[PDB]
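Field: COMPLEX_INPUT
Field: COMPONENT_COUNT = two
Field: RESIDUE_TOTAL = 824
Field: MODE = joint
Values follow.
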Amino acid sequence: MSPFPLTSMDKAFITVLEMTPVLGTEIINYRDGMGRVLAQDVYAKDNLPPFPASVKDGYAVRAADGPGDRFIIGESQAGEQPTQTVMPGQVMRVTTGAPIPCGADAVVQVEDTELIRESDDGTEELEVRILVQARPGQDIRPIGHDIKRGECVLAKGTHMGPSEIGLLATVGVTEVEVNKFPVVAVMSTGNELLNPEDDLLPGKIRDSNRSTLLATIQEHGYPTINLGIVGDNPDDLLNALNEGISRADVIITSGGVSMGEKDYLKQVLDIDLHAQIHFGRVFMKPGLPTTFATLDIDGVRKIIFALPGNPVSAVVTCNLFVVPALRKMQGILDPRPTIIKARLSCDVKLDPRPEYHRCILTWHHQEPLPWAQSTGNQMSSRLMSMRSANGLLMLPPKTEQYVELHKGEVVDVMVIGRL
Amino acid sequence: MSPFPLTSMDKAFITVLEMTPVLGTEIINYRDGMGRVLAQDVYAKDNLPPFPASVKDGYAVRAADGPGDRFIIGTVMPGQVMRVTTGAPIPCGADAVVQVEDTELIRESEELEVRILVQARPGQDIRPIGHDIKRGECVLAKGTHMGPSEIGLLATVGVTEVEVNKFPVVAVMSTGNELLNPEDDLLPGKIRDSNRSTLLATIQEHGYPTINLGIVGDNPDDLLNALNEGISRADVIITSGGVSMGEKDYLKQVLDIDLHAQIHFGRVFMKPGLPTTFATLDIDGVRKIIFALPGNPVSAVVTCNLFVVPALRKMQGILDPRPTIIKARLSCDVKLDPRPEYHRCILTWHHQEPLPWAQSTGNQMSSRLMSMRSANGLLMLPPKTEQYVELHKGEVVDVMVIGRL
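Field: COMPLEX_OUTPUT
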């Protein structure tokens, strides 16, 4: 029974990626590019190195002239192009990374030039000690070596990290078109809720989901709006949802998603907002009452997650459904989260439905599979740790065979933190 | 020759840790707790839950009555029952489970009546007061590196102000008369400063405040001016400036002689990053740390990840600031180099295979293997030997994790 049917996890997820749209694009300074996804191809407009550059500190060694005693006509420096022209017989001193002049397919190495002399108060040193011809293409980085001009250095769809920001800087593309980040409105619903700042009154508890979700989404860098607590009443919900709709791309609620007097949210979404509820229940533990809706305004699509009020339910479903949704909204080609194999620390008896537990992944070095230790039963139990929950342990549903898992058994863990 | 002895990657890392301080504490709003390490035990004031609470949807029931057909009010008298939700409070005269699955309703008006199925157990599926958290109990210990769930806990117990270690402000500069800002268009003999950007990005990913000190000419006066600035204004100064060979002297000289910094090592046995240099400076009781990194752009990310980030993590109170190292397999053959080598790579799991695959992203040369995905880790290859000359596709290697997976 239920105005909404039980949706399987595999299906609930697929549904979220299908209905979640990619956001439009936007120009930003390459420094604000971390996390961003490139909406354009980026071509080089200069070579790198742009001048032949010296690999080591040495001289303008001709693999043509060879041994003969050379006239050191001066030094090539890192910051200037040599206003010189190494003619045959002579040689130019060059420090590592400095340009090479019109002389040779030169080189040296702090090894060969024994240095004959530096006459007249050793200011300059007009006497090079050259051995014999080394090998034409040895320690020179030719024009273009690292990057050629008009070369695409980063493709469209690249999810940018520090190296890419550096790469943009290398080629001087300081303004770049990227997918917008989604702005996320978060609210909590329920007459029992108080703010963390408040002192408990009878029958009430402090809202914790709102902080946990904002933090969860802030950790991925998406902007957020805190809509606060909202009563279990149609009017107040509608005003809140409307404000969220007007100021965000994704609205997240927590609380009141079951029975009848906690059924206003779904009723408000469908009846007063005319949103498309895609699923209202998913066969999972925790997160069964999890609801996902879409709403379209002037062509623009907005997405709505109504999450359970249960605190643990909240963080789990936010990680399973919201984050991947947001990763797509933001341009990531494969928005699915990474899942690794880990060994369980404790045996766990299975449940009819798939179980998700916050756990802590740890590599006990010099040993292949990480160990996954779960962080409690369904709360902060006796599990206290200096480390923060790191993965979501994903337990299969009970089969009439496979009824429970033992210590050491390989299990799938969805990574949810910086390892 | 060379003054500074060749230091192993091991001792270099240990020294950085040994000489790195742990920053002082500061009080923050709990919402600003991400990545922050508690500097106090946090105690709960109230009892969570503050009332007996339901576990799963269903009905509140009397233990005496047993199973049977009953009324749904909404006190609970003999013969009656109450409709109740997830974590909702339990009424008067109730004490049992009776969740929806074990119920089979009989009448409907609202709802007239319902029907329970077995023998109630005094206190079943009911969470007593303080079952989850009890008065004056320590929920989070001093030293806890907080994630989102820790912020949730703080909010739950109603502790909005918290004492945490300070985060380190880090200042960055580049040096070299060949560097222009990226904003600038090329001039003859010059190239764009890419390190400064990469380092700043790198440390920002970790959420520490950064300071862009800019390009400095390789001039003792200027150098000293920059160093002095970042020193007064930050806890850590990082610099790029090809520090070995020809004339790197400039920097170590200025450290040694003008600032009076203690240089702990100047060369490490690794590739890339041989010239990496590390120093401390004690000023009016306070200790600043200084990393002089090479100027090779591939050296930047590697050294910063190998030496800086672990320093910053100790500095903000993380008890074990060593990076996370995992085993993975090589996506392909790699020749070994006389010094132990570090390569950027992308870590990937292929459905139902226990270890992930480490695909390299080139040797140095700007961008070699193009991906729609950032480098995830640092491949940690051993040094070359007469007989141990290379590694094959499939072999197991250590991989340092430097990004989110």
